[PDB]
From a paper:
The two domains of unknown function (DUFs) are homologous to each other and are found at the C-termini of the multi-domain proteins PatA and [name].
To gain some insight into the DUF domain, we have determined the crystal structure of [name]-DUFsp. to a resolution of 1.72 Å, and using isothermal titration calorimetry (ITC) and nuclear magnetic resonance spectroscopy (NMR) we have probed its binding to some plausible substrates: the precursor peptide and intermediates formed during biosynthesis. The absence of [name]-DUF homologues in the PDB required the generation of a SeMet [name]-DUFsp. derivative, and the crystal structure was solved using single-wavelength anomalous dispersion. The SeMet [name]-DUFsp. crystal belonged to space group P21212 and contained one monomer in the asymmetric unit. The refined model contains residues 920–1064 and 1077–1184 (the residue numbers correspond to full-length [name]). The Zn2+ ion is coordinated in a tetrahedral arrangement by residues Glu977, His1087 and His1090. We have been unable to detect any binding to linear substrates (simple peptides or peptides with heterocycles), indicating that these are unlikely to be substrates or ligands of the DUFs.
Numbering used by the authors:
A (entry chain A), B (entry chain A): 920 to 1067, 1070 to 1184
Write the structure that this text describes.
Amino acid sequence: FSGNVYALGTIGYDFGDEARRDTFKERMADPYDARQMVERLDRNPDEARSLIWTLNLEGDVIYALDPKGPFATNVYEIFLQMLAGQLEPETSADFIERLSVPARRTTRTVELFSGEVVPVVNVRDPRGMYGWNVNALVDAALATVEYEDEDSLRQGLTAFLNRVYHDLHNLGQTSRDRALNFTVTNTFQAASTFAQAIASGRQLDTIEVNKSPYCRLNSDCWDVLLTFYDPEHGRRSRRVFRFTLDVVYVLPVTVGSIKSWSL
Amino acid sequence: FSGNVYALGTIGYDFGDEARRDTFKERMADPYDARQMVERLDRNPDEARSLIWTLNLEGDVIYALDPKGPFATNVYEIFLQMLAGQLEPETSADFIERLSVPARRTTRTVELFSGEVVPVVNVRDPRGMYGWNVNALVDAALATVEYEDEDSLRQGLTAFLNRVYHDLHNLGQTSRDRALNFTVTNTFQAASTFAQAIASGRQLDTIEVNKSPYCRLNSDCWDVLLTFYDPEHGRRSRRVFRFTLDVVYVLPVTVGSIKSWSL
Ligand SMILES: [Zn+2]
Ligand SMILES: [Zn+2]
């Protein structure tokens, strides 16, 4: 055990070398066309093992993803599902533009076709691997609040979810870094919780992350505070949301319910 | 000379102590209502000198702003203009949600009412101090391209400009950090340049910032590369934008025109 990783980004594939590239050049017109590769791998699942699967954060290849154990086949299936979803029209229910990947660290690295050497992490099974698109999260959020305003509320929720992602996304190795990446996951999953806040005419002000006093010993718990405010209307109370995250586990967990109160 | 600062964020004010707070409690119903303070200071400009003016990045008070020199009055006027714009309805032409502040470092600090001690920076005159709102930038961008699609293009441009801000915003002290903050400024100002890219169905992939070989000695130049790609449609060329920024000056400058080419 070399520690855990909790990473966000973009899934991709890499041929590693020219021999593997050539193998796939014979199997479709253009193996660099990911649409064609998705089709090929969907028809021939075992060929997925012949690629290097990568996690990419805003153009930086940060990890190679190695499925191992009895659920490797299951994991390859999710890899393909995520690859395919990224290629969908932005209006598709299966569209994917956000991704979470929990993994175990190793001391293994792999060389990409480019010559770059990236660290390998073990993805043992599909649990905790999520793919989202922002529009779908916003629609879920809108369903829980009363209004028209919808266009304004939709754009406010969109801007909130995107801000949280870009403010926090990171390499996902240290405890704090895993906590910040998992904060994004938790914010996405609990999007509707913040909808009344945005609908009330508030917007995110601060994100604060502290080591939590609320967990058992030998946990790795962090308290995350999101505070919302209204810049336009005088003295108005600030709304705080708190949740507690335990990242000691390779599958991080939320501890208790999301708390909220005014200041 | 202790170096330069190039900072982004939110302008605010602070009373420093209870005596100064009380002075303003007698001058309006509620001095914590920034709307009331804007009104008071617009009618009584010299009272602005009695406040601590702050720059705030996502809830962290990062600097106290000290206007000095023969243009201090001019600078206080801009402070007020920025404070007022932040309070406008989001639909107002004068709405402000993004801010750039160039300044000279000092070795002076000031204590805020809360007891926090923050570094003071000197803002000598209004040059290079910009206030934007994203919607207005997007409207400018849309004016230069052909379409309908507008709703889709508007949201794509919005997401781009917001991503760049949250990806890059920082404390703004080191050369690299000033370069990244100024990249945001330059991206905003040159928003229309990226509009064809987004209209073509591409989106930002990577931001890369390197020390530039294209400037004179004793400059502090950085090359910024923004690469755009289309995740949906097969093999399609990537579009690169490059510009060169010199942050040696307290007012950073762009060097040459923005370059663009395909890969
Ligand atoms: Zn980002
Ligand atoms: Zn941000």
